[PDB]
């Protein structure tokens, strides 16, 4: 379903990101002059990523939410591959925090809207398996989307768990890590992680190498959030943080958490740390 000729419909604009499979360019939509995100792969300088690259189109083309970075497309042009996005110009949740720290109305809120993207996932039988503040995007009005679905797996009627080592280390279920049959309630243990990475402003460990990490994660009890928090934000981080994924909540269940209930408010308000991200970057 792929298609052709992506500078008949997009203009490319400059840089503004990269990881070393290829590069991410902001971009214009000539048909509507909407802003668009694009991500162009040389197939050539990756080989064993090809398999993950044609996941993970085939993930965001099959997903309908506005919880989820919406797909424009995918281009074929010579030897290059064009990924096309909505541009979410608020930049990212850990973007968010490098000014300081939140507080827990804030933290809620985003919690809230990611619980939003999983639900939505998990109704659709996929994992994200790299849930973390990085991989939350924001737009510049404070709509809150999940990103980056490089590892997501899909489950399906004739296979009801997963099994690959996918994930980012800090962030990981410790079944994920076992190779164990997992599946979404994976993503529930990354989110308790990245609720003490949105209150911490760090994941638990983070100061040590990841693959030290890779062992003391499923052995070490599970982290909790410490220090002066409210009593509803720690139950939700603890009942995300079991070691035994049929004991965690589903994200439907945690939308209706205390502590979802009682702080967050709407996303509009999420500008106010787009403000500070804004002033702090231009002033470093
Ligand atoms: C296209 O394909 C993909 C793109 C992405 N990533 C992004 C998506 C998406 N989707 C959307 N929007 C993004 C916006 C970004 O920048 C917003 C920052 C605001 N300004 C930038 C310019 N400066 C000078 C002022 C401040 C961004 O930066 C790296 C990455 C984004 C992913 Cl994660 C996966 C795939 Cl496959």
Redesign the pocket.
Known sequence: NLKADPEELFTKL?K??KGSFGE???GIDNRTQKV????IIDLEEAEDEIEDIQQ??TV?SQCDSPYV?K?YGSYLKDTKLW??????????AL?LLEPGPLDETQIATILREILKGLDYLHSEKKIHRDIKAA?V?LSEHGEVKL????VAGQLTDTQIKRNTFVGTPFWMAPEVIKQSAYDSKADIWSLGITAIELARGEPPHSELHPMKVLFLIPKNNPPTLEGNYSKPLKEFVEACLNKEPSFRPTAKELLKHKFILRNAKKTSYLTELIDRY?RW?AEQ
């Open positions: 400059e503004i990101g991410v360019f902001k668009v995100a694009i991500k993970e189109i965001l970075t797909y990924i096309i996005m909505e541009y979410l110009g608020g930049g990212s973007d991989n995007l990103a980056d679905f490089g804004k970057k």
